[PDB]
Copies of this chain bind each other. A is one copy, B any other.
Amino acid sequence: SGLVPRGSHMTPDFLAIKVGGSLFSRKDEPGSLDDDAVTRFARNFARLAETYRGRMVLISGGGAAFSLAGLTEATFEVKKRWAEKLRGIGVDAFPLQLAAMCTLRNGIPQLRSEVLRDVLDHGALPVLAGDALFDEHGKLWAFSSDRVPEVLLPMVEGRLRVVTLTDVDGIVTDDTILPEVDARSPEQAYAALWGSSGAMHTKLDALVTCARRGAECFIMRGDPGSDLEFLTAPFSSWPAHVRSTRITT
């Protein structure tokens, strides 16, 4: 509860990188991943993981009453595919079932397993994804990958950077990207989604939630072969070609 120095000149202490399903699969082609995209992304994620050893999670999107239980199995497969690929290039990537670690209480995700923190402290790379989570009444709910960074908020010390890679450069207004969103008052960003129609709304809600708890959050375009080293760097030092929507408080 100490004073945390923050700003565009500061280096993040922790990276939560989420890779959208759009970027490595097609809905028209169920349970089929684009292996080339996974391969190329994995190379870039591997470099980040070495710098942020024990200070990063990779969150995968994608993945095919109690019937929702199949979701846990579907998203486990996606985590396996990333982790296998990453281990193949020397990263200590370990998939973790969020449903075994987290439950919902009054709608808020609750981390209920100490294992995630231990895995990080051991210097491994947790590979996470969305899931089917139980609430306090025993009902299952689909918990989007986009919301996984929320589960990190009480656990991460220091400066959390959350980056959601998607198939657009940010929040589009009209015609142009919105470069900055103030999480204390983001009504303009929500108004832009209404202009352009719920995937991005879930992203915004999640990243506003994280930004209100100090995180530096980005919506930006992913590309399998793109160098991501700049995500280790202070925002003010980013290359000029990089486009994003930045959500902060």
Chain A residues close to B by CB (< 8 Å): 66-67, 69-70, 72-73, 76, 80, 83-84, 87, 92-97, 99-103, 112-115, 118-119, 121-124, 134, 137-138
For the complex of A and B, the 7 pairs showing the least CB-CB separation, nearest first, are A122-B138, A113-B113, A100-B100, A97-B97, A112-B114, A73-B80, A66-B92
A134 touches B112 (CB 8 A): no
Flag if A115 contacts B118 (CB, 8 Å): no
Known: A69-B87, A70-B84, A84-B73. A115 touches B112 (CB 8 A): yes
Which residues of the other chain, B, contact A76 by a CB distance below 8 angstroms?
76, 80, 95, 97
Tallying the copies of this chain within the complex gives 2
Complex alpha-carbon distance, A67 and B93, angstroms = 10
Which residues of the partner chain B approach A121 to less than 8 Å between Cβ atoms? 138
Q: Are the C-beta atoms of A100 and B115 separated by less than 8 Å?
A: yes
Contacts of A93 in B (CB 8 A): 69
Given A95-B73, A113-B112, decide whether A101 and B100 contact each other with a Cβ distance below 8 A. Answer: yes
- For the complex, give the distance between the alpha carbons of A87 and B138 in Å: 16
One of B83, B101, B112, B137 near A69 (C-beta < 8 A): B83
Q: Sample 12 A-B pairs with CB under 8 A, ordered by A number.
A: A70-B84, A70-B87, A73-B80, A76-B76, A94-B99, A100-B113, A101-B101, A103-B118, A112-B114, A113-B113, A119-B134, A122-B134
